[PDB]
Every structure is written in structure tokens, then in C-alpha cells.
Amino acid sequence: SYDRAITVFSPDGHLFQVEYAQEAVKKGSTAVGVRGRDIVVLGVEKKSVAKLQDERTVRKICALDDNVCMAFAGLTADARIVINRARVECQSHRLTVEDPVTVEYITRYIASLKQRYTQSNGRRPFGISALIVGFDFDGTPRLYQTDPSGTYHAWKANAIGRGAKSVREFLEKNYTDEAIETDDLTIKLVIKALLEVVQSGGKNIELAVMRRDQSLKILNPEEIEKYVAEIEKEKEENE
């Protein structure tokens, strides 16, 4: 009847440790994913810059296969475990049903793994939510969102972690046909959405994008810093 010992239903039925791993992703770094016509974008803020930290090892935008890339929020260690399992699953599926795995299939596998740590008083639930995004073999963009409970609803434009509804409900009124027609136009959408909750500027706003049939390509503060280049893209052409 309490928070306690996952395998218990509340007298209403709110089996609580899942309700808390559900709320465990309210302290992770905000993650955003917007799916365009020919591009899928995946942006994560990093307001733990910790200047003397190697920006490469803390990176949160992981890749699951040639056609699937992943973001998350919450307990990083659980995320690493589930990402390792998902990568092994992608390769195993390509070994037996040889084809690039559908974004649907790997999303369902991750959700099933998350769910399988909800029975069996046993384990504790994974404390992360994932934004599975990628292109499928038939050539269409996808975007998915898992939860510690196991639900895997697929969206068109998402946000998890700190400031969840802030980003999402900003993004309610900004997803349109004239936001996915051209690629950099799609990019500027996610940038502005993250800037709504950003730690005041492009402080390690770890963006990675994916166009059709090529790769995951983490945009990085290049000699041009497309990060900043686009920050004052919007911050010039706002007026």
C-alpha cells in the first residue's frame, strides 16, 4: 500500500517504484527529438559542463546501429547498460533476420527489457527514458519514446527530463509543414526549443543529427561552430 517493494499495488493501484523511476527522469539532462521530412534531429543539453571534463566520455547521444541512434535522460549507468543490450540486440537481429532493424523493433526490444525489470521484486526498474530515432529500410523517419514502465509511444517531436512539458508545450505550437521542408530549417527548430530551457547559451548543447542512408553525425562546435552559428542565426533573425 506504499512506495515500497515494487511488486505491490496501492489500494488504488499505483505500483510505486515504477511511479518513481517514472519521476526519476525529472532530474536528468533535458533531451529533445524532432523528426523532419528527410532529417531526424536529436538534441540534449549538458548543464554539467564541469570544464575539466573530457567532453567525449560523458556524451549522451549514443548510436545503436547504422540506422538507429539514441538519446536518454536520468541515471546514466542504467542508460549504458540498456544501450549495450540494445546494440547487442540490433546485431543479433541482423544476424538472424538479416536486414537493418526497424526503429520499431529496437524500440520494442528496449521497452520489453525495461518492462522485464518491473516484476520480480528482485530487480529495481531502470531509471531512464529513451528517445529512439532513426530511418528505416523502406525510407521513412521515425521517432519513439520509452518509459521505465515499458510504454513505447511513438511521437513526432518530443522532450524528456528536466523541463519536460516546458519544452513539449513550447513545441506544441511550432511543429508545422514549414518546419520540416528543409534540413537546416528543421535544425533551428530543435535549437530554439532547447534554448527555451538552455543554461543561457550553447553550453555543451550536445546536438546530433541523422540524414538518410549516411550515418549519425554529431554536430560539433566546428571552426564555424554550427552550434553558435545557428544560435545567432535565430538570435539575429528573431527580429
Binding site: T7, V8, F9, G13, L15, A111, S112, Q115, T118, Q119, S120, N121, G122, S149, G150, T151, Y152, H153, A154, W155, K156, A157, N158, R168, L171, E172, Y175
Partner: protein
């Protein structure tokens, strides 16, 4: 069944409230759909196993009986492999 979409950004087709157990059984979910996903998997696997062993279409009553057989294994943790340790959290409507 009502679907109760939360936000416009959500794909309606993603919300999976009516599934195809087989060509002649339909199912409706309500509750912790995380559990419905394993119950429906059990139902589909059982229907196909019955068709494989017995060259016939599995009757609806037997499908729901097998799915119930997946339930009622609430606590038997002496039986180690992969038990629920809890009742499911879903109510089902097998039509066929």
C-alpha cells in the same frame, strides 16, 4: 475503445488498444498496457502453436483460457524462472 491522446505530437497509430490475436480474434486492452504486451504475445503464440499442432483455427474460448493460464501464476517464487510475483494489471476483451 477510447484512446486518450495526451498531446498532438503523439502519433495516434502508436497507441495500441486493439490488436489482432489472429485473423479471427480481436482484443481490447485497459490498464497497465506494459502487461498487455506480454499477455497478447502469449495469446498470439498460443494460437499459432495450436494451429501448428492441430491443423485448425483455435476457438476463442480456448484462447482466453490459455491467456488466463498465463495469469494466476501470481506468487510461486519457489518456481524461479521468470514469474510475475504479482497479478497482471490489465483487463482484456477477446472478441472473435
Amino acid at each position: 475503445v477510447e484512446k486518450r491522446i495526451t498531446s498532438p505530437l503523439m502519433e495516434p497509430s502508436s497507441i495500441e488498444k486493439i490488436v489482432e490475436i489472429d485473423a479471427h480474434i480481436g482484443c481490447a486492452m485497459s490498464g497497465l498496457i506494459a502487461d498487455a504486451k506480454t499477455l497478447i504475445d502469449k495469446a498470439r503464440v498460443e494460437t499459432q502453436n495450436h494451429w501448428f499442432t492441430y491443423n485448425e483455427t483455435m476457438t476463442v474460448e480456448s484462447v482466453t483460457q490459455a491467456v488466463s493460464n498465463l495469469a494466476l501464476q501470481f506468487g510461486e517464487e519457489d518456481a524461479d524462472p521468470g514469474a510475475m510475483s504479482r497479478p497482471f494489471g490489465v483487463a482484456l476483451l477477446f472478441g472473435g
